[PDB]
Structure formats: C-alpha cells, structure tokens
Amino acid sequence: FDRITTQTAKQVIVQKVREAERAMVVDQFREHEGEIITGVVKKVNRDNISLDLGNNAEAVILREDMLPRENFRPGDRVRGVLYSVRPEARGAQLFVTRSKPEMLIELFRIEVPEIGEEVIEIKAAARDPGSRAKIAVKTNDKRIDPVGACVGMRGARVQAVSTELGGERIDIVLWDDNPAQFVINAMAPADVASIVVDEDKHTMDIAVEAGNLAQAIGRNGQNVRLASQLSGWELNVMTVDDLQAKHQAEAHAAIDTFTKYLDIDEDFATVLVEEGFSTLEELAYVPMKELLEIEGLDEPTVEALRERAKNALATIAQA
Ligand SMILES: [Mg+2]
C-alpha cells in the first residue's frame, strides 16, 4: 500500500515557497546558459576556481575548461561561457568554460555586431585552446562580407578575440556547401594542388604544392587536425607525387579484389571497373539492368557475379 503523506500547514506553506523561488533561480540561470558571463574569482584550488556572480551564485571553471598557461588570483574578473547548469548537484551547479569552442563563438558574437544581428552565421568552430583556432562563417546577405566583418578594420576585431584567449591564433574561413571547397578553405594558409574525395569512407586525400607542406600540416600536425575538426572529414595530406602513386595502387587493388573474391580473370575485372564498377558493394546491389550495358554479359552471368560479390561482402565483413 502506498504511504499517506502527512505534513503541517506551516511545513507545506514553507516548502511551496522554497520550491517556487528555487525554480525561479534555476530558470534564470538556464536563460543565460550558453552565454558569456563575468565572475569574480573567490578561491583558487588546484583543479578549479570559484566564481562569484552575485546573489549567492557560485560558479566554477574546471581545469579542463581553462586555457593552458592561465593563472588566476583571487579577486580577478574572468569571463567565460556557462555551458551546464545542474540544479540537483551536491557540489557546483554552474559550470563555466574558456577552452570549449562555444567560448570562441560567443566572443565573436559580441565583437561582431553582424553576428549578434544574425546576419552572419557561424557554421563551425575548432580549437586548440591557447594556441590556434579555426572558425567558419557565412552570410545570406548580399551586402555583407562575412570574413571581413569578423576580421574587422585592420584586424582589430579578430585581434580582440585572440587577445581575450591569450593570443590564440584564429583563422576565419568562409563556409562552402561543397565539402572539398570547404576543406580547401579550412586548409589555409596552405595551397592545395588537388583533392580526392572518398565519399563512402568520408575521407579526403589532399595533395599539397611543393614548399607548402609544412604549412599544410602545421606544427605538430595542428593545421590539418583543426581542418579535420572544422569540416568533420578525415584528411590525409601528401605530395602531388604521392597522390598519383596512391591512385595507381588503388586502381590495382580494385582489380585484384575482383579477381580474388569473384574468381575471374584480369580482363574481366578490368571491364567491370572500366564500366564504372569499382567496388564489391556496387556489383552486389546495382540494378541488374545497369550491368546489361556491358556487351558480352548475359543475364545468367550477371546473376552469378552478384551472388559471388554478395558472398565476398559477407566473407570480408566477418573476417
Ligand atoms: Mg586517392
């Protein structure tokens, strides 16, 4: 049997008022969630700092939410993004960050009025906190230069953001709907010779012009990493010569895969690839009508090829 609750009139009145007021505080903080707030440093622990926001509001910037070489003294004014509010937490309930990408984004929202007005949209942001960052922007307004608005007059705006982030070097890149073009943009200041897009694997091979290699990679691989993070594509950087050489190796691997797992001769495999059939997946599930465009292949053979291809697919997947 469920329990029957008994309280006093005083208890109930007090409880309902406490809860109504507590919910108001929670709601207000949830309104400013994802925004930059300013706090005063109270205590500087070994793995975090305490912030005063007024009205008994205590916020924390954890170690992993700080910039690498940042040191704070009790009483300092610090800004950061309130990215998580946890009402039922026994410890801290307000979490502030300076290292997450949202910090970079919100700093640009402030510094660039065109972003505040939602005339310019931020489509991606990738950071290596304290060191380097990329941010992608776009506009649907024919009057606006989105990169220029973010850089500002003589770079004053982007420098302002960089200074707040301790000299973090920021590349402002133009968004593009074509992934290859976007990645080319994100790879700056590198000069790309050519890109091969593996759409199935969601990876890109990037050939970089001579002398532009160290830039393309960046120190410690920083630039291609940031470009990978910004675009969401896996990126492989190499020389022009390497890319050509890799292409031949892939062209042979396709034929050999066909010869081995379909048990056909090399001339047969070649014809398949020539007609645009380059993978075991394609052979398996292509409309059988598309395979009839090849002169020399009857309906029985195209049925047998599919069944061999489907078997190879099952074989490989379990291997
Ligand atoms: Mg390739």
From Swiss-Prot:
Entry's localization field: Cytoplasm
GO molecular function: bacterial-type RNA polymerase core enzyme binding; DNA-binding transcription factor activity; nucleotide binding; protein domain specific binding; RNA binding
Chief site of localization: cytoplasm
Disulfide cross-links: none
UniProt keyword list: Cytoplasm, Host-virus interaction, Repeat, Ribosome biogenesis, RNA-binding, Stress response, Transcription, Transcription antitermination, Transcription regulation, Transcription termination
Sequence repeats: 263-313
Domain of life assignment: Bacteria
Residue segments, region Acidic repeat 1 (AR1): 244-319
Occurrences of domain KH (ranges): 129-192, 201-267
UniProt keyword annotation of Oxidoreductase present: no
Transmembrane segments: none
Induction remarks: In response to low temperature. Negatively autoregulated. Induced by cold shock (42 to 15 degrees Celsius) (at protein level).
Deletion consequences: Mutants are sensitive to DNA-damaging agents.
S1 motif domain mapped to chain residues: 34-99
GO cellular component: cytosol; transcription elongation factor complex
Gene Ontology biological process terms from the UniProt entry: DNA-templated transcription termination; protein complex oligomerization; regulation of DNA-templated transcription elongation; ribosome biogenesis; transcription antitermination
Record note on domains: The N-terminal region interacts with RNAP. The central region is composed of 3 RNA binding domains, S1, KH 1 and KH 2. The C-terminal region contains 2 acidic repeats, AR1 and AR2, which bind to protein N from phage lambda during antitermination. AR2 interacts with SuhB and RNAP alpha subunit C-terminal domain (rpoA); AR2 cannot bind to both simultaneously. SuhB, NusG and the alpha-CTD of RNAP all interact with the AR2 domain and can displace the AR2 domain from the SSK domain (S1, KH1 and KH2) of NusA.
UniProt function note: Part of the processive rRNA transcription and antitermination complex (rrnTAC). The complex forms an RNA-chaperone ring around the RNA exit tunnel of RNA polymerase (RNAP). It supports rapid transcription and antitermination of rRNA operons, cotranscriptional rRNA folding, and annealing of distal rRNA regions to allow correct ribosome biogenesis. Participates in both transcription termination and antitermination. Involved in a variety of cellular termination and antitermination processes, such as Rho-dependent transcriptional termination and intrinsic termination.
Subunit structure comment from the entry: Monomer. Binds directly to the core enzyme of the DNA-dependent RNA polymerase (RNAP). Interacts with nascent RNA. Interacts with the termination Rho factor. Interacts with the phage lambda N protein. Interacts with SuhB via the AR2 domain, crystallizes as a 2:1 SuhB:NusA heterotrimer. The rRNA transcription and antitermination complex (rrnTAC) consists of RNAP, NusA, NusB, NusE (rpsJ), NusG, SubB, ribosomal protein S4, DNA and precursor rRNA; S4 is more flexible than other subunits. NusG and the alpha-CTD of RNAP interact with the AR2 domain. (Microbial infection) Interacts (via N-terminus and AR2 domain) with Escherichia phage lambda antitermination protein Q; this interaction (AR2 domain) releases the autoinhibition of NusA.
Family: Belongs to the NusA family.
Protein name: Transcription termination/antitermination protein NusA
Gene responsible for this protein: nusA
